[PDB]
Amino acid sequence: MRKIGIIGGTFDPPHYGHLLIANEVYHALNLEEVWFLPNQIPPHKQGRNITSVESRLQMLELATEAEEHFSICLEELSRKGPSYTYDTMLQLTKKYPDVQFHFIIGGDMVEYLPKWYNIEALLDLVTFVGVARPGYKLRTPYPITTVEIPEFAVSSSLLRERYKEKKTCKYLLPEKVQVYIERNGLYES
Template structure:
């Protein structure tokens, strides 16, 4: 029997409670062995975030996930040049762990974007996509997507960056240790 592994990719600039809630809900509802957080360098669908260096994003992710033994961070995409294509990463991971089946977690915005994903037809042979609801996005797709319902909120990394820019509190939007790290390093401030 293969192990079921969740993958949650993103820039995580910064990681916040909704990332953790999504990972935990999918972990529980699908009976996964673990969820791997996969920070990317240059996502194909948007510009490089450029707000915080990759090493600091990884550190914040490690702080955010440290208390959950079913969460881990895999920073492999950050050492590559160019865009971070899911196909390349998942091809690598499936070769490394042929005894695992991968569940790639995406929000409704990315479900709508699936037709534009790099080598989508081949990627579908490597992963099962798991779509989680997001406000104002549909989970309907021409591609097979397993839907998981999670609590909806408009909390996002861009909202947190905006709050930091305005010097508004971010308590409870991010884990306490992440908030302390952001404050200590003055990330996202003017």
């Protein structure tokens, strides 16, 4: 009954881990498509200095450009304040009543779930889909759906650090995103 996947994130920068998953879950659960949901202010990193919304959205667009099963949901970029997932999903559920949402999260977020705002109410609005990530375990008391994928320990923090240190980023994120980053001098490119 209209299965849609949603992968929320800061995407700073978006990389192959995000694309990997998005594709894996899309296929494993036979979803109609996957919506990438960039937050405006990460709800759990409100004090962190992060790349501007404009620069993050551009990088995301470039990462999901030629991927026909991927699109971007601008719901959080359309309202002020911390982007709590519960608020986003309450609104999305009202706007798309015949859609069954599958919220895709990596191992690290799976373990973070008890810290999520209104997690119990949120569990009634979506079906979480947890995917493995190196250094994290799919350990949680909540009713998540797991999806076996070929794990990839790539991360934005590792990427930001490598750009700063002038270290290799080959194979870790799309070429166009790399171009955008170096061109704009992001992360000390």
